[PDB]
């Protein structure tokens, strides 16, 4: 068989020029779109504000206009999904993860509009959902869409354009090219069998996707925490322990995200109305909290920098943590079109900080600075739950730019994935495509 | 399908034992990775303490230089040829191939021969990196623990062996991320699913890295401070630099292989005429390492110096040409030493050169050569060895200028592209091919 290898080696990394020029166009597109979704969600969350500022004086009128303005968006959200593509609901990656293994479909003619405008309304309303997966999925579909258009054959031009697309997606969502490429080659890919995916294409994809972003959002970052302090060697063990904490909690959260999916399902029994209704219900509760207590609502970013700086009293943190687990569980387990990736970055950040503070003074000799453990634990949930430490770390890194902390970030992240496996956790994203890919049969 | 649901729900469950091993392996590849680093130092140093001791007399100096070097080189090639002709060359291909069960992992042999061998080939100061040399000491250390505690399965095998190669490249550049990425992008079986435990590889790298840090904290390998940023209307200049590397990447790939043939004659496999031509080149290194330091040695020393723009354009061109040659000589001559690092040094020099031309051909971009240096520092690792993703994440960890990440990719990928588009090949695979093919024909 080695008589085969020698042949392959000498042939390695020769991807069809055409598959390439396409990863490039796909990228450019997933980019332009990735931006438009970003800009849109903004415009909305803003109007909603421009409307509270316009009812300033009257309070319960305010709280009402808040709730409704939100609820109305949420409804228009769930709806579009349920009435035109029940897949756009949930994160948005599993249906791509599975679409990679040819175990799910890529109906772009549908899911494009429904995931965009859908989430563009679910997020625009300000629910605890990220543009995370939502952009990934808009991604893949855009790839398949160009695939079909210029009609390209082969499993290579299929898996490729579809996988580069998902990546170019996660890239423009966090302006983190490396983390995108790494998400594919670590999570998205077929996690149980060699695949014909062109990594050189994926790159060109991410590259274009990222240029586009940069072209529209330069002069500012998503997260900015400035160069935090360094992390002494006799300090690393505290990151193993924080890594442990996430590892045990990672699975638990994984249950709640699935369970709540069942439980909440009753409350509408698949009925488009009682659903879209319970939709506007949660949606509204978001507008309301997004005002009465902003931390508990919205994506999560806003408060990231604020928590890393140590501006939230310990207590305040605990509240925000608990209040978030809940609101994130609600919005996501309730099949609303929106990611849970970002909200997890926000969750870890808060837990990490908390840990920080306890350490920051339980060991005055270490000269600790909570903010480090925040950066450490910011992709820790993305580790213990979704189980892709390598992508978590390289994501955090690109966003928080504190490479000095890289060692503690890993010892935490890995320390997590470890305790997670050691306690039965599972790739939250796979634990979804399972249930899904199952029920399709189960429904037989 | 129905199988899938089963697999998914079972994902990422690597045998606790395979893990606790990746951890010990790592600790070991670490301790060793360091000792090799410390050793090569001690030597390059004595050699100096000996020139300082013959200060006055010049041709006596130049001689003591050449010989002290040549003697090490000889003791180098020898050990290899007389006890493990595989320690010669980089050291990765025999691990790359060892991963596909197309080559062997004789650790009881290659450990001492690669260590002390290179610890003498590098200690003498030849244009060779501790790059692959450490990777290979790595893998072998994994297989060694594998055998010792005797673990079965293809997973317990491929894993400890692959984590080991990674923990290796990690302690060689103190770059954990780049190590993990080297495996999952270059080392791992390129054309067929494999049973490699990435969670293990990590634990491996982690331990390997702690060890390093425990012995080399308070200083970096490369330090270039926060360079300037890179404007969008500036990115195209990185595509063009990426093109330049892409065309040259294959060419260099030929020379590294060809020179391997050519130089082979000059000893015809004969342990003596080889070990002799060995001390020949080795000596030429001590000599140049003194008369013109840039042209010799690993390459690091001059990296920072070239990024700062301290070498006149001309001076760069010289150092480039002089380096292609000396790197080709030492590596194509089957001496036990990597060519990974020497390529980092090469790109850095080419990138800078490009820089300077740009730095003034476009006074309106407010350029700063040093950026293109960081950009092109892992550009050869891209156009030649073809692993842009590991190159980039390596440079990043070493030069810590994430701001430049976009230009670094547009260059790197821009290279791999022009390289493929011109027939280049994974220099490391283009070796295991030759190896594997000849080995039978």
């Amino acid at each position, epitope marked *: 068989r080695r008589r085969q290898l020698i042949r392959q080696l000498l042939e390695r990394d020769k991807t069809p020029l055409a598959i390439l020029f396409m990863a490039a166009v796909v990228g450019t597109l997933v980019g332009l779109a990735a931006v438009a979704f970003d800009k849109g969600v903004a415009w909305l969350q803003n109007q909603r504000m421009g409307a509270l500022v316009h009812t300033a004086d009257n309070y319960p009128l305010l709280l009402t206009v808040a709730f409704l303005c939100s609820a109305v968006l949420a409804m228009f959200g769930y709806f579009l999904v349920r009435k035109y593509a029940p897949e756009a609901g949930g994160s948005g990656i599993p249906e791509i993860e599975g679409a990679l293994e040819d175990q799910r479909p890529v109906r772009w003619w549908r899911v494009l509009p429904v995931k965009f405008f859908g989430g563009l309304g679910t997020l625009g309303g300000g629910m605890v959902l990220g543009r995370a997966g939502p952009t990934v999925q808009i991604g893949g579909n855009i790839g398949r869409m160009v695939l079909d258009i210029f009609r390209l054959k082969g499993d290579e031009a299929r898996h490729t354009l579809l996988a580069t697309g998902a990546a170019a997606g996660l890239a423009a969502a966090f302006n983190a090219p490396l983390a995108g490429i790494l998400f594919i080659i670590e999570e998205m890919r077929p996690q149980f069998r060699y695949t014909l995916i062109s990594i050189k294409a994926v790159f060109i994809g991410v590259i274009m996707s990222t240029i586009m972003y940069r072209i529209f959002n330069h002069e500012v970052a998503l997260i900015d925490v400035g*160069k935090l*302090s*360094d992390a*002494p*060697l*006799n*300090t690393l063990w505290l990151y193993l322990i924080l890594g442990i904490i996430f590892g045990i909690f990672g699975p638990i959260f994984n249950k709640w995200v699935l369970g709540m999916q069942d439980l909440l399902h009753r409350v509408h029994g698949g009925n488009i109305t009682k659903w879209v209704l319970m939709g506007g219900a949660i949606g509204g509760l978001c507008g309301l909290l997004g005002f009465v207590a902003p931390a508990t609502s919205g994506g999560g970013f806003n408060l990231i920098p604020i928590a890393t700086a*140590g501006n939230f009293s310990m207590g305040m943190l605990v509240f925000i943590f608990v209040a978030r687990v809940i609101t994130t569980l609600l919005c996501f387990s309730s099949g609303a079109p929106g990611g849970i990736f970002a909200p997890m970055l926000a969750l870890g950040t808060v837990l990490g900080t908390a840990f920080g503070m306890v350490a920051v003074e339980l*060991f*005055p*000799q*270490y*000269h600790l*600075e909570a903010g480090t453990f925040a950066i450490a634990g910011m992709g820790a949930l993305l580790a213990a739950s979704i189980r892709a430490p390598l992508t978590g770390i390289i994501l955090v890194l690109e966003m928080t730019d504190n490479y000095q902390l890289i060692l503690p970030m890993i010892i935490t992240g890995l320390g997590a994935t470890l305790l997670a496996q050691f306690t039965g956790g599972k790739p939250l994203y796979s634990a979804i495509l399972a249930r899904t890919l199952a029920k399709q049969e189960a429904e037989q | 399908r129905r199988q899938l649901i089963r697999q998914l729900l079972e994902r990422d469950k690597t045998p606790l034992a395979i893990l606790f091993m990746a951890a010990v392996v790592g600790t070991l590849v670490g301790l060793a990775a360091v000792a090799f680093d410390k050793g090569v130092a001690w030597l390059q140093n004595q050699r100096m303490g000996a020139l300082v001791h013959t200060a006055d007399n010049y041709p006596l100096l130049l001689t003591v230089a050449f010989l002290c070097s040549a003697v090490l080189a000889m003791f180098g090639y020898f050990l290899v040829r007389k006890y493990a002709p595989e320690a010669g060359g980089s050291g990765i291909p025999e691990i790359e191939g060892a991963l596909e069960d197309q080559r062997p992992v004789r650790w009881w042999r290659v450990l001492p021969v690669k260590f002390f061998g290179g610890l003498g080939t590098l200690g003498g100061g030849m244009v060779l990196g501790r790059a692959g040399p450490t990777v290979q000491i790595g893998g072998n250390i994994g297989r060694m623990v594998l055998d010792i505690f005797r673990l079965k399965g293809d997973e317990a095998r491929h894993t400890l062996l692959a984590t080991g190669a990674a923990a290796g490249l990690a302690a060689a550049f103190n770059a954990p991320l780049a190590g993990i990425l080297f495996i999952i992008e270059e080392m791992r079986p390129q054309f067929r699913y494999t049973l490699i435990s990435i969670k293990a590889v990590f634990i491996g790298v982690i331990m390997s890295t702690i060890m390093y840090r425990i012995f080399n*904290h*308070e200083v970096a390998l490369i330090d270039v401070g926060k360079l300037s940023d890179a404007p969008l209307n500036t990115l195209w200049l990185y595509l063009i630099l990426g093109i330049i590397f892409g065309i040259f990447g294959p060419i260099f790939n030929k020379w590294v292989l060809g020179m391997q043939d050519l130089l082979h004659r000059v000893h015809g496999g004969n342990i003596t005429k080889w070990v002799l031509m060995g001390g020949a080149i080795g000596g030429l290194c001590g000599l140049l390492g003194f008369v013109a330091p840039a042209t010799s040695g690993g390459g690091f020393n001059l990296i920072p110096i070239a990024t700062a723009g301290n070498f006149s354009m001309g001076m760069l061109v010289f150092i480039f040409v002089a380096r292609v040659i000396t790197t080709l000589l030492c590596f194509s001559s089957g001496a036990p030493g990597g060519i990974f690092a020497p390529m980092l040094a090469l790109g850095t020099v080419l990138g800078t050169a490009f820089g300077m031309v740009a730095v003034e051909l476009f006074p309106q971009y407010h350029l700063e050569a040093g950026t293109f240096a960081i950009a092109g520092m892992g550009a050869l690792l891209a156009a030649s060895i073809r692993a842009p993703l590991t190159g980039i994440i390596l440079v990043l960890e070493m030069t810590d200028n994430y701001q430049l990440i976009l230009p670094m990719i547009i260059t790197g990928l821009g290279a791999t592209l022009l390289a493929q588009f011109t027939g280049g090949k994974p220099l490391y695979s283009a070796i295991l091919a030759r190896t594997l093919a000849k080995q039978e024909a």
Partner: antibody
Amino acid sequence: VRLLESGGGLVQPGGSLKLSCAASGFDYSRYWMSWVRQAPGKGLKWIGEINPVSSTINYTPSLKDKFIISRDNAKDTLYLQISKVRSEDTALYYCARLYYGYGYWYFDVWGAGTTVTVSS
Amino acid sequence: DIVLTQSPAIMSAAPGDKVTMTCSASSSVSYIHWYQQKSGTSPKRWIYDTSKLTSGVPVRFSGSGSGTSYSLTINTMEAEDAATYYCQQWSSHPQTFGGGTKLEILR
């Protein structure tokens, strides 16, 4: 890295003087700074330390505002405010930059020192 | 807070001579440090983390110990070792200091 300190002098018991540390030679931030003091031919004692973002100040066990350590990361200077000056405070005050290897912090680079003489 | 107790309060030795002094901890400690203080001069950091010589410390210098007792040692004590060493710790906050040991020359 040079550490120059000023402000030492004669003071009325009860008074309250302010000592300064002028740092030349290193990114003053990223660093911790602390005051150690040595009584007239006697042991060295640690007054206190203060980080970069000035968000953490610790002092050896002593009455609230017995000491006020502060830092201006815009002049790279470290200050020490001593109150209700007694006789014990008659000592040699040293400022130093804190740094470590493993994480068991040491007083990296010290400074010349300034004398505080407390007398009527 | 730990009480570092430097063993010999004083002592004398002749150039070219091995010398050892101590540091006794009121409790456990880890990786202590030693500073050399030249009469009328601002404290210089010598050994650190029980042993490491600071970039410049004469090689004849070393010392160490552990648990609850460390030491400074000079193998062949030259002249330029006229001063006082203070063993300081900070493994346990707040950091403390030994009463020092005075290295006086015998002649």
